[PDB]
Amino acid sequence: MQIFVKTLTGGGGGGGGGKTITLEVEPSDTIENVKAKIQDKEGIPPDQQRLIFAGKQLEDGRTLSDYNIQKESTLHLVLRL
C-alpha cells in the first residue's frame, strides 16, 4: 500500500508546503516501522520524528490500521528535539 508523508508549512508562509514523499507500507505496519521508512528516505532519526494524522499524534506501537491510515493517506511529519 502507498501512503504519503508531508511536513508542516509553518506559520511563515511561502516555500511551498505540499511536497510529499511516498512510503510502501502494509496496514499492519507499526508507526515505529513507518518512522524507520521515513529515515531511509530523509535521514531523520526515528527519535526525532513525530507523526500526526487526523490532528492526532501517533503512538509508536499502534498499526496504520489502528489509526484508519489507508492507501493514499497523508501523514504529517514534525520534528521532535
UniProtKB/Swiss-Prot annotation:
Origin: domain of life: Eukaryota
Annotated compartments: Cytoplasm; Nucleus
Effect of K56R: No effect on HLTF-mediated polyubiquitination of PCNA
Domain Ubiquitin-like: 1-81
Cross-link for Glycyl lysine isopeptide (Lys-Gly) (interchain with G-Cter in ubiquitin), residue positions: K6, K19, K35, K37, K41, K56, K71
Residues marked Interacts with activating enzyme (site): R62, R80
Modified residues (Phosphoserine): S73
Protein name, entry field: Ubiquitin
Function: Exists either covalently attached to another protein, or free (unanchored). When covalently bound, it is conjugated to target proteins via an isopeptide bond either as a monomer (monoubiquitin), a polymer linked via different Lys residues of the ubiquitin (polyubiquitin chains) or a linear polymer linked via the initiator Met of the ubiquitin (linear polyubiquitin chains).
Residue positions, PTM (Microbial infection) ADP-ribosylthreonine: T74
Residues of the whole record sequence present: 1 to 73 of 128
Organism from which the protein derives: Homo sapiens
Result of changing S73D: Phosphomimetic mutant that binds and activates PRKN
Post-translational modification: Phosphorylated at Ser-73 by PINK1 during mitophagy. Phosphorylated ubiquitin specifically binds and activates parkin (PRKN), triggering mitophagy. Phosphorylation does not affect E1-mediated E2 charging of ubiquitin but affects discharging of E2 enzymes to form polyubiquitin chains. It also affects deubiquitination by deubiquitinase enzymes such as USP30.
Gene (UniProt): UBA52
Site feature: Essential for function: H76
